[PDB]
Design a protein around this ligand. Structure first.
Ligand SMILES: O=P(O)(O)C(c1ccc2cc(O)ccc2c1)P(=O)(O)O
Ligand SMILES: O=P(O)(O)C(c1ccc2cc(O)ccc2c1)P(=O)(O)O
Ligand SMILES: O=P(O)(O)C(c1ccc2cc(O)ccc2c1)P(=O)(O)O
Ligand SMILES: O=P(O)(O)C(c1ccc2cc(O)ccc2c1)P(=O)(O)O
Lengths: 344, 350, 349, 351
């Protein structure tokens, strides 16, 4: 019952200012932090070899798009390798991001691991030496981080253990980040896999998030210096029933209103399995929902910003401009969506 | 991880409609739910005998104040006895309240009891037969309820046990109320007793409220059909340091923003040990605080609405108009305060 | 992290002494604490009218059985009404129990109530004014109490909420009891209803008991001054897979060994739906189980001590002795069973 | 509310057999798992250079003691480095341990880290890639592991957060170990630092252990395949009041009886700040305590087995037998203590 402040007022101000820059009006996050094993599949899908150069080039493609994205992109999440790579003009990618008015983010988790005694549930690892890494990332231009936990809706999942453990590791990660001047993005993703309906997803999302913010409270996390990256509330991929974008928006905003304290600076939705357009329309519906929403509601999109660019590129240097144009298309669409002004 | 809905959509709409009516803009709650043993202290302090009639008359005095209070009072909390009493003209008090545009509330807890193994901490009892009582109260005109838990800031308090137990009993009470169409007011009062400073109170309040809303989630409570009745964040009574109303306001709004989900319909502050004027000024500062507040921020005042009326009355029938006038003045002041329009005459430091 | 002792050494000794008397070797508990609504069903089943007199008479029948039961019965749980009734010789029943060497117990809970938002799960009420009632019961001869929580094995039950809520109310009840010199019997009964198998019951029992004793710890309960009244670990009533009494015993003792601190003075099993004989055989197997058991393992039986006596009585005054003889028969059987003296792959668990 | 078994019957049997071998009657654990940075302090204190060779030689000194220790030592905990070092005859140290009838253990945690928002409290790290490490250690001869959490008794500590977090990380570590056939030693150490009295330590130990075993339950840990390594219940170092060994034993055994399920195979006490002799006397008092104790009560001693041997050695090879002799002497003393048979010649409700 005694306060031993985790953060000084100066530390708090820094975190809050960073968090606010990332989700400033009209702005969202480009998620380009695919691990080498994850980006491999994407290159493979356009018949491109998974080399450091192709990864460097593709990231350059995204990060060096014209200045039309500048007001659309408040932050860019990088994977470790990309943080220390350079553009053709010799500029480190973090410098490229900052020069276009963006904040640099770093994915810091080390993937999921199985929870014994559960039906295929996982927790996430990556806490070991995390404090030193965060200090180093901070020096090298990073101001926020990402940590992904994954939960599954099934007959017996997500279990009490899975919810409790994932909420706890998220809280530990968030605590270490804030000690090093890094804004943590808390990502408790509930997968869309399954035949569950919308209100089951809403129920699970509400329970997961209540657990998350209790955990953050127990660990003395400064919410104004954090962001939330949740799934939208949607039916499962195999659900036959159909819902309008307004119903999805209503269920999403409702779940958040019942669990997310106003002090949280912003919510940066993941797109999950949604198409580029679907992701933009839902985000727009969410921002048009008439209920009171005391946090920024924007995007942290990977696929939903990149899918078309990757295809237009096709691994061919000459299609650079064509590819970039597709990315700018989505960045502009989503900058409008997070203001509720997007009309396809 | 499977939903067995506690409430149907219609039950939800009813609770939500009630909750919103109580804290509509400019409106707050008159807390007149003092137990017979509690009102005894009030009457004795003005040299008046504690009889059922004097209790009936005093409550009548408040409930029949002129129509200037109508837009000020969205709800009135009554103690059991008063719910079944009548005004001089034969009208049941609940009818008196409703005809003036108010919602009728009922205090349903049965007081604090000691928690063994703690430094003088308590939980609250009153769950036994609560469902039957609530159904009966609902039938008899009550639409919301009050349940008071008490926590104290000390060297080793509030303990983990006290916080967990009180949050859990509050959630049980809220669940039972909502099954019977009653809106529960959740009151986790942190007493002002002690020499703690403002930021100690803010810390404890944040921890208490986080535990409260985790418990409400675990018990499947419909937040849109609830109200919160917390202490304002203030220094302890014995704290020598001094604070402005703006700091009190900032600390209060900050604690709430960090713990109370937007879905909560409203926050109805208790006045605690504050004077009538102090309570109004603080509530006004809270509503002027520039930070974003996604819930109604209003009052659930007992002493802060009644203190002057009670004194002007003095147990004498002939002081009716003078006494009622004091009550109306405070009702008017607080209706302005809960809109941030009352006149008595940002920082990451929190 | 600071101690504010709930009990003095003297209070502790009293509670511990009581707990040990109740479960002394060879002894168990007669559960005669059926509420008026529950005993109604039994009287009805033998075509007897549910009157205060028939209830008084039936209870008298059990409490005044001959001295062969004295070493068998360490405790008798009564319902409120019975606590204040008298035998034909004018003696209050508590005095009748004590004179036969028994400890007097009182059921203090006020029944189950539904938990909203769950699939038919309940918690238990009865905390209001419980401290005053306990103080009064203590004056009137009661030295221990009973509080029954009920949990159900289903597709989505027992839920996290149900386990947490029932464990917490049990802890509150135990705390209040110990403040008033009453030994609380903690009964988190997991019902046998359903077609679940033995290891599901063992799993649920292990999880419930872990929750119970964490709760008891959080509420500063003095375990040496408590008793546990759990279900035995058995398959569901409708389970098609068959088990031996040795497997039931192994699963039961394993579950307890994994959850029940040694400091707990005794385990007094409820018989549930088991027959009189089945209850005795299982209890005997439990005590024969070769694993180490650091608590007394005995009985708190209602049906398993009374079923035959009730039928033999049949509501006829003249059948008193015949009825009593049936009860004595079961008391003797279970007194042997709780010593492992009754004759009618450990890692697989 | 549905079981998805973490372990098969065969996995359970393996873990149980290992746990039982380690704490068989008369046996305890030699804790020789001091990290390179921790062992540095011990060598410096005897004016010896902290080199890999000197560390190898010193560990060799302990592990190759004569066969009088064989019935005394059920297990030996090694630090990573030592697990892959060899004796002079080319034998890997794990084989030396096994040939003397001992089980091989490995410390797998990566030290404490600060918990933000607390008064100097910590949790422990080391879970990352722990499964892979455990699989490798198993392959390389290790059958059990050690993970140390540290809690401190102060005015506002151990806090709820500290207790919960450390209990939870211990449960994660135990879960991963058991998936890889490794018996986890659960060590929730409450430091003796401070001026608190005996009953404060007993109170805190009881609360910590209750949290530990709830956490282990939540994470589906197989208790029969675990060991507990707790502090004894003692007053703080700076406590002015004095207590007998009988009182220390009573408080220690009482705390365990109130929290540790019978299914736990054994309790291997840490000696903490105790002298070699004090550690043996207390352990002996614990085993003579008349209360019922349904688990093995033995030792997992570092300093209390090594202190005298290390000084007698002084870093000089010619003092080998003398140094070993001091180690053997403590091993024999503690083998007797964990049977309640140790002699220097060789109210219950108050708690
Ligand atoms: O065909 P692909 O390359 O897998 C493509 C896709 C899928 C996931 C992606 C994830 C990313 O983070 C970035 C780009 C992606 C692109 P989609 O599945 O949307 O067609
Ligand atoms: O003379 P008292 O009884 O102390 C008076 C007082 C105190 C507490 C009160 C509490 C109430 O709920 C209603 C009226 C009160 C009136 P105050 O302290 O405000 O003068
Ligand atoms: O015919 P009944 O009343 O159901 C009879 C019975 C059943 C439950 C009983 C429960 C008791 O607590 C005491 C006596 C009982 C007696 P049984 O079913 O065992 O024959
Ligand atoms: O002089 P040192 O090296 O500090 C010695 C000591 C202290 C702690 C020790 C801890 C160990 O794990 C193994 C040996 C130790 C030896 P002590 O303090 O007992 O004399």
């Amino acid at each position: 019952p005694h306060s031993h402040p985790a953060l000084t007022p100066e530390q708090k101000k820094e975190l809050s200012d960073i968090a606010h820059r990332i989700v400033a009006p009209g702005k969202g996050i480009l998620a380009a932090d695919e691990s080498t094993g994850s980006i491999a599949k994407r290159l493979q899908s356009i018949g491109t070899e998974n080399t450091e150069e192709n990864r460097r080039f593709y990231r350059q493609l995204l990060l060096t798009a014209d200045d039309r994205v500048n007001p659309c992109i408040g932050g860019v999440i990088l994977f470790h390798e990309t943080l220390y790579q350079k553009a053709d003009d010799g500029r480190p990618f973090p410098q490229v991001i900052k020069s276009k008015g963006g904040v640099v983010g770093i994915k810091v988790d080390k993937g999921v691991v199985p929870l014994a005694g559960t039906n295929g549930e996982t927790t996430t690892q990556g806490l070991d030496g995390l404090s030193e890494r965060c200090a180093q990332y901070k020096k090298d231009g990073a101001d926020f981080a990402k940590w992904r936990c994954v939960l599954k809706i099934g007959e017996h999942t997500p279990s009490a253990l899975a919810i409790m453990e994932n909420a706890n590791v998220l809280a530990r990660y968030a605590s270490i980040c804030q000690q090093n001047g890094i804004v943590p993005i808390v990502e408790p993703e509930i997968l869309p896999d399954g035949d569950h309906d919308l209100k089951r997803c809403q129920y699970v999302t509400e329970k997961v998030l209540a657990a998350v913010y209790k955990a953050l409270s127990d660990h003395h996390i400064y919410l104004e210096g954090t962001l939330l990256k949740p799934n939208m509330v949607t039916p499962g991929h195999a659900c036959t029933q159909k819902y309008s974008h307004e119903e999805i928006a209503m269920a999403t905003v409702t779940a958040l209103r019942r669990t997310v304290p106003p002090a949280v600076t912003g919510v940066t939705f993941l797109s999950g399995g949604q198409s580029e357009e679907e992701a933009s329309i839902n985000l727009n519906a969410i921002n048009k929902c008439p209920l009171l929403k005391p946090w920024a509601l924007t995007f942290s999109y990977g696929r939903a910003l990149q899918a078309s660019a990757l295809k237009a590129w096709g691994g061919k240097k000459e299609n650079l401009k064509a590819a970039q144009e597709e990315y700018v298309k989505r960045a502009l669409a989503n900058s409008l969506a997070c203001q509720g002004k997007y009309t396809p």
